[PDB]
Swiss-Prot record:
Residues where Zn(2+) 1 binds: 50, 52, 110, 112
Subunit structure: Homodimer.
Protein name: Protease 2A
Residue ranges the record marks as coiled coil: none
Active site: 15, 33, 104
Disulphide bridges, residue numbers: none
Organism name: Coxsackievirus A16 (strain G-10)
Function according to Swiss-Prot or TrEMBL: Cysteine protease that cleaves viral polyprotein and specific host proteins. It is responsible for the autocatalytic cleavage between the P1 and P2 regions, which is the first cleavage occurring in the polyprotein. Also cleaves the host translation initiation factor EIF4G1, in order to shut down the capped cellular mRNA translation. Inhibits the host nucleus-cytoplasm protein and RNA trafficking by cleaving host members of the nuclear pores. Counteracts stress granule formation probably by antagonizing its assembly or promoting its dissassembly.
Catalytic activity: Selective cleavage of Tyr-|-Gly bond in the picornavirus polyprotein
Length: 140
């Protein structure tokens, strides 16, 4: 579990969104595994607006932050889950990290701010939903 709190937005994995998220919906995209809902209180996270391919992510199944190298956002095949059917998830970045279920949500960050949020993983893979192109998170 985990979310990004920027401005009056809460960014979560779409497959972990609550009823309150759906009832206060701003934007959702199943192909990216992302959902954004509105918040009453202002958040403290800042979104990175950069081209970093190195950063650090939080792994809840280890209680640890790990440094990682990650690929550029791309269309990657995601096998069948209890969450989605075989498809291609877009705007996904992969790294060698550990992951296990209970993982989605953890933040990936660089020196500029938040880059994205664990979304994929396994056999040593940990893939993350990029948010750096969502410029509207910084306003309104
Ligand atoms: N984004 C997806 O399609 C996910 C949905 C949940 C399951 N999934 C995973 O890769 C689970 C790993 C271990 S924590 C992430 C595919
Ligand atoms: Zn950066």
């Amino acid at each position: 579990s985990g979310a990004i709190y920027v401005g009056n937005y809460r960014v979560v994995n779409r497959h972990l969104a609550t009823h309150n998220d759906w009832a206060n919906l701003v934007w959702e995209d199943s192909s990216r595994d992302l959902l954004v809902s509105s918040t009453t209180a202002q958040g403290c996270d800042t979104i990175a607006r950069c081209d970093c391919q190195t950063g650090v992510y939080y792994c809840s199944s280890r209680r640890k932050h790990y440094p990682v190298s990650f690929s550029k956002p791309s269309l990657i095949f995601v096998e069948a889950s209890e969450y989605y059917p075989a498809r291609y998830q877009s705007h996904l970045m992969l790294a060698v990290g550990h992951s296990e279920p209970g993982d989605c949500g953890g933040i990936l960050r660089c020196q500029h701010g938040v880059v994205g949020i664990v979304s994929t993983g396994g056999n040593g893979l940990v893939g993350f939903a990029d948010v750096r192109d969502l410029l509207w998170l910084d306003e309104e």
